[model samples]
Target: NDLSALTRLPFDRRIEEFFMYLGGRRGTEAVGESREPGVWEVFRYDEAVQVLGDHRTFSSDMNHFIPEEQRQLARAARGNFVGIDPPDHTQLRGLVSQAFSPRVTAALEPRIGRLAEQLLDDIVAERGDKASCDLVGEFAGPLSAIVIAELFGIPESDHTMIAEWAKALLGAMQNTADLVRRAGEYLVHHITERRARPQDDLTSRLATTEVDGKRLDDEEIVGVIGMFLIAGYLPASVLTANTVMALDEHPAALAEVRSDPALLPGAIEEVLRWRPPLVRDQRLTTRDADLGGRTVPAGSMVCVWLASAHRDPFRFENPDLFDIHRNAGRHLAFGKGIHYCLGAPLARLEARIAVETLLRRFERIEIPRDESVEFHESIGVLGPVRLPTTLFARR
Candidate 1:
């Protein structure tokens, strides 16, 4: 089918096709091609690791793509650690690390559990004994937003607006060019203010953070705070939504995890592969590089399709099947190598607590047959835009 037909289809179909296109094998050729102005190279996660590891060759300094008009904004956004190459990237990430360690993350487990239960309580109160609900709004959306709010210490007054801003930022990440520039720049200014005078949230932690001799500027603090919501929040939200959907399809899987709470961790892994949060991670090659067998010239874009990589035939014995006990930790849902998501442990903690708490409050998760569910159509972030569900309380 032509690209036109692909675009015209409903949102869910489009997302599925995107998965198929990225996941399909194209021999051992480098997934690089000049589509539009420059080029975007797509490669397996393993190849991406090789390229990203050689920071000199595949520099993560994404400023080159920032349009001349948007360069100031992009520079101001020098907030996101992912857009820079080490040792700056290494150094900045280190300072921020102290704030996000396992202890800090583990503390959120109980908080996330409480958030999930509260959300379910609201669902029950609003719906009463049995009523359809928009789980995205009443559940996943608020659950993730609240956790992020706690992580950053966002004030109770700001929670609702921050959640809305987070949703906008997620939209910006999935977009490129002007839209992302505007969103990135706007966030930079907001974070700069909070960093300067200091707030009680994570932004202050970043603002006050100093080690060796370097201290993070307003830009870095903004970027770090933005990353918390952008990278840190959405991935958990998507996993939760997708896990609920999967359990709805395979009720037995749902029952198994609920019966044995110990299985929550493995189930989280399986659901990550079974339906990953984002579809791809974009990388820019600084120098000439080789991928999968094809030669890619210097200054090209490459994407490590994590969604596809998780299901690669070479990686797992039964790549397509969702086996909860498949030693699922090996999956590429977190990407691989130096650039592996730093927030992974925190995400898993949230997911485990999220699923377990929901099961404790509600006996079952039911996908509403009447609602027409849709997913956002971006080549990058992936997940349902809306999920209609019904929660049943246990007697």
Candidate 2:
């Protein structure tokens, strides 16, 4: 098989082969220090786990390495817990933990189902009048935006604006200052309003919620809500789009899942490995560490190339093949240990609902005959930016 031919295939299909090529290049090495001084990369599964699990020695707090000006500009909110380590991570995360708890995520089931149904109704209604529709833009993206809008107490009219902010959050590095500024600019207004007059929404809670007698100031409030906006909706949209694509790619898997709805969860997990939401995860060594027989001294930067980890032969059998029933164990789609996504439960709940609702209403979905898929370009995210499709209705 010509590895170069991988590019002609869809991103999802080609990604697997590319990882195989990467594995061949790296061979048995579990860790390799990058040529860029003080940087290291973890490729093998066990070592990737070691890097993520041992947070004490390998810290998440890399803000120290970032220039002061860049750090200030990048600080969307004090609630940017992703880069914070230990005690601060614990305290800050606790403030918004209940917002995405299993209880809260589960409660959105009926609401999410209705949104899916309503969105599908539009697609089905337009079927006779239109040749094709953008699955990501029309359905997947809208559903997530509406859910987030309602969560943040955003008005129905602001959904589009909210979506814009999410897109800005995912935009290129060059636009980061503008992205943070845009988010912070809009968010502070909303957060201030929430503080002046409280509501049941997430922004209001972040505005007033106190942890250990300390309340989050305006920027902190904006930061958490902004992070949630970028983190949750976009991934949910990607997962939903990819689930549809994965099922379309694997007919037998589709038939199996459709015939037995119980298999849907496993199928989603398979899709997560096949097309992860994020491919690379980062950490900085707080102190000396050893992985794959190499010693990484304190302050070294580590990149856990999770894409390779998912296909690691030691961790997964027949690594390159996509098996819905692998049941091998948990893949590091969500990072391991304490810093694992707080959005995990919500993303799961949203995806499960979207898939079930979609599968129930439609016979199947696929790319429009003439249009190819378009994907987002981000540092780590892997998802469709424009997925135009022809959804066949069951009736």
Candidate 3:
């Protein structure tokens, strides 16, 4: 339906439907043996690793292919490290990653658990008797944003404001320049606040961080936070909702993980592999290259499917089955290699806490058979807009 382009983006149809199409018609075993590995689109696990492994051959900076009219805007957003190539990516990625190291996020586990529990507590207190409520919006959505907000040392009052602004500018039609400008205002104010009085948080680190003997200034800090906010919150929120629904769909596994929180980490990994928040990650080749027996010319666009990588029959046994005990950490739901998302542990901790809190708080949870679920607008990021929820408590 995207009339602007003749070819659909990979998995442009709903991703759940795409998985069914692959597993259902093709049959899981047949996929490994008879799949076509075109030069441009890569689906199997091994090719996915190859594409992800060498960012030099397949660069993230696709600004050259950007439509002529939009190219200027692309250049303006060069600080968005996810879409840029090496050298610059090396510096920013190195600096920003230091902020999310194990110790920082590890200490936040207790607070994260509380946020998830309190989110549901408030929802039920205010509207438990209402016929329905949005699980994604009221609970899953806020927990991710508020966590990011706390990481940035943003105030509780500003959490709602900044999260809405951050959400508005991404995943749908919206003003980019204006949103960044306004969010920048809030960040720089806090940036200076942290500068004047140091705190035990990421904001202090960003405010005070120095690279190549030059301290990061207002614009540089804004660009960094802009990337961090979008990357961290959106997919993290989507995964939280995805994990909750996955548990609801598979009750026996849910019961096991709930009773023995020891199994919860594996359960979280299984959901990520079985149903990811996002689908494909794109790259533009820098030179003529051979992948999966096909030659890709210089500057060609390549879309690698993360979903297919996990569903790869050779790599994962009974790939379609959501088995909690399966060895699932190898899947690249997060990018692999140089661009591997460092926030993975933070994201994992968030979902594990959110799901555990929900399990402990409610004896049962349900969604109407005919309840509507509206997915996010982009094929790149797959998540529901509304998750109609009805919670039942222990009597």
Candidate 4:
């Protein structure tokens, strides 16, 4: 549970290595920088957040990971609000918000809870007494996909394929330029079908919604819907697996949450903060900006390391340690300011149901014999690439 080794790596190389491991593809070393093993340069958490929070000062115009053509397609669609500046981003986000609001998610809890239980039942049945199971595959991803399908009113038959498509779109391990385009292609087909025969779901909502002189076009609508699903599904899914692993790694914390249902929420928050799905946020500087004494030039891509920021000593007490009771809600897991994740309410509800139901059903869960945890690191997500475990099945 100790990350002392990671924290001790020299700041620049260690941070760079962290970024690299987190799925960043860096060019050869920048000139004038030595690969020292001991110096840790610090950036003020507030100053850094200011840089990220200011879309005007630092834009998201570029998509480093996504293919250029797909990026263009995305921007053409709904102006790709995730990549746009305010007024435009504000308008699109506002219109989209109408459909994905807290009220909608709050109403969907019973259904989501039911889905969680259904998945757990299936996993228990499949694993029998001691069979290996992947929380990611058997439960988290599927749960999110099914709930999203329900929310989007996509036919239940489409769930498996959609999960496949969503995986292709966001799988940290397969994040090549080609895969990014392929993900876009897959989404485009779905969006086109939805538009031609609109459904009673969020996609249909955005495809039809109009905002102050700008109705969303087909491409923009498609991008919006795809991004929405990705945002909603990944964090909750990742958190579910991370929570399971945490419980396995620290049985005391597991028992603590199981002993008191009220404590579960705090534990969930701490889990999300401690092991965030997204390890970084990308920003393209609008003007030359000085971060800590390091000046990041305009137009260069700024990879803001939120994982590092989350564990910054200046921001949180004993930032390296995980304490469930601490005020962990302020962490940048969902990010900050206007672009803070729109799917947080749904993610929270999903995790609450997922963790609660999981604990209620399983007497104990542990990693499989000979099963080693291998994780895919990405700027966007952390944790096991394939998290295989054995759940103690019901009689």
Candidate 5:
């Protein structure tokens, strides 16, 4: 099956069939044509790890793979650390590394907890006897978006607007070019404001912070800020929502976690492996290399099926089952190597607090039997767009 067509299939089933089709292949194998003409797809578990980690052989910059006409749009994203290789990537990461460190994330626990409680409280107040709400928008989306917004020093007034932009971007509800363009303009305006009147926020810090006597230009600052909106917020929101959905699907495991909160961490890990928020990542080969016994020519498009790798039969025993006890720390949910997610620590903390807060406040939480749930059409990020659930209060 073609790689582009894979996006149209159901997330879990599509990934399941993908691995089965691979069947113990070690390195890279040509799956089918990509969306672009003349660009072949190279996919596999080991090869994904190999390509993702070895940035030298496979470039992260998408410009090489994009069409000539789209180069301007591609250039708009050039300053993003995710799309660049060292030493620029290293430098950019270094500047913002301290903001997302474990210590910083730990310090925000109480605030995150309060935000979760406040959201739940609002839901309770609005639907007093009904006790039902769309967790995706009310709780999960706002929780993560507000955290990132505040972390970036975005004003409270802009939180809702930015969150909506992130939702549309991740859901593909609007044209990507228009989304990226507007996001760039929005961030540039804020970055400029931060420059003129510096605050103690991360945005101000990024604007003024210098490394080795080098400072980030407007493009770099805008791209980094845009990354938080486009990449950071969506994954956290999706993961939180997906975790709730997972619990509904696995009642036994849900009880295990609800009884002993200690299992919450493991349950989150299992959810990431079972249904990671992000499904696919792309890389382009920089030079000719041997992948899975085949010579992948330079400049070839390399698709990393992170979801498939998480469920690879060769990698894990009983890879399909949802086992909370299973050690899934090594999962590529936040990815691996240098380009690993900088916001991972923060994301983990937010989800942990959210789950704990919900369990603490509600006696029972269940997805409505009559309501049909639907996942976002974008295969790149997997989660329910409309997650309607009832939250029963403590008796």
Candidate 6:
């Protein structure tokens, strides 16, 4: 099968096909010449768990798979924690673990609620009665940016600028140097200030915190902060937008959620399973290993389809059906193992608050009949690029 053929299909349907038809009956196969040249696309639930959880066999350090000539470029990449395996990853993650602790998340509840309400207020005022807005840009995107800025102790006034820098960082077409420079420019100032006048924020905490009894340099701290901007901000932005989109598409489930707000958490998990924002992740094999009845050679790239794995029939009952009540907290949207997303708690908090606030403030949310929704071209990131919708006021 031409793996690229999946690109021609709708994002959701493409994953469904991968789970149901592609990759043989088990939904696990190797696409030798596909997207990544010599990658194995694993869609089986069990296999995916093995690949993601067994970090010893499948490493996250992409440097192993890159050509020696491009190795320097890989090392220069940001987010050392996300790209490296344990011990090093563990040390880096431990330095900022408190920043995302449950206490911090709970403390953020009031502020998150205000942000959600304020965003909806603007949306309603701009498009009252019958109005259309790109929910991604108008609400989810900015909301994520502001939340992350506050987390980093950056001024709310700088949220837009930080968000813009983050947007540029994610642009695949953008030059790597510019991306580094854009984030570096602002972060350097913030780090300098944090060092002089320490605050109770994550940035200052990182500035003062020592790992292995050694203080991290300005570069390391900046990389961690940059990771929060890209990994934390963008994914949460899309998660909220995707939740609202999924609810709009599944009206019955939407009504259930609006009627019983208790279901909102479960409903959010359903959204993660049904339409996760980050759909694919790649891990490089440290050595030769047997995966899904195939020998994956050392240093080969193994692509894990988290979206398709969630829909695997062997692991989920009636996997294709979007049932809010179904237990799916184990979804790979936030991934597994030590490399699990540090921002998972915050992402869940933001998405829950955003969706709950949107439903409470608005009587109805709908996709305009004539407007066409657009999605990212690659299955790598699965969410709306432009989600235009008309939101109605509550009676």
- Candidate with top lDDT is 6
Q: Who is ahead in TM-score, 1 or 4?
A: 1
**RMSD after Cα superposition, model 4:** 6.5
Looking at model 5, report the run of 10 residues with the lowest lDDT sum. 22-31
Estimated TM-score for each candidate? 0.84, 0.86, 0.87, 0.79, 0.85, 0.90
lDDT of 2 by residue, 1-395 (tens): 35346645567666656676558745768898765778888888899898999988888877656777788765434678887777878877887875445665666678878888887787778665233687788788888777777777776678767766666555347688787787688878888887899876777776666667867778776778777777677778988888888788778998998899898888888888877877779998877887889899888989898777888878788877778898735688878988888777777777888889878877756664332787665536666868888777776
Q: Mind giving the per-residue lDDT tens digits that candidate 6 earns over 1-395? A: 65567656765676556445533644434332245666777777788889988899999887766788878767644446888888678767887774456676667778889988887788778767776888877788888888888777897788777666665555254577777786687888998998899876778877777656866678888888887877776688888988887777789999898999989889889989988888888898899878777788887788887887887877889887889999997789999888888888888889999988888878978774332566666757767666788888878
Candidate 5 yields a Cα-based lDDT of: 0.76
Model 4 stretches astray by more than 4 angstroms: 1-44, 63-79, 172-200, 207-214, 368-371
Ranking by TM-score: 6, 3, 2, 5, 1, 4
lDDT of each: 0.69, 0.76, 0.74, 0.67, 0.76, 0.77
> C-alpha displacement of 16 in model 5, angstroms?
6.8
Q: Candidate 5 on 1-395: residue-level lDDT in tens?
A: 45456555664565455555544432334344456754544445566778778988888876766787877867535457878788878887887674345655666777788878888899999888459888887888888888888777788788778668667766544489798888788888888998899876778777776667877787887877777766777788888988887887898998888899999989999999888888778887878877766677887877776777777766778887999999997788888889998888888889999988888788788785432455676656667767788898877
- The most accurate candidate by TM-score is 6
Candidate 1's residue-wise lDDT over 255-315, tens digit each? 7888898987888888887678876677777777776667767777666667767766666
- Lowest summed lDDT over 10 consecutive residues: which window, candidate 4? 25-34
Candidate 2: global Cα-lDDT? 0.76
Candidate 3 per-residue C-alpha lDDT over 100-134 given as tens digits, one digit per residue, 9 for 90 to 100: 56787887788888888777878888766342578
For residues 209-312, could you state the per-residue lDDT of candidate 4 as single tens digits?
Answer: 76666667767666776676766676778877777766666778887888887887788788777777776677766677666546666656665656766666
Pairing residues by index, what is the TM-score of model 4?
Answer: 0.79
Tell me the spans in candidate 3 whose CA falls farther than 4 Å from its real position: 1-16, 23-39, 64-73, 76-78, 129-131, 171-176, 210-215, 369-371
Clashing pairs in 3: none
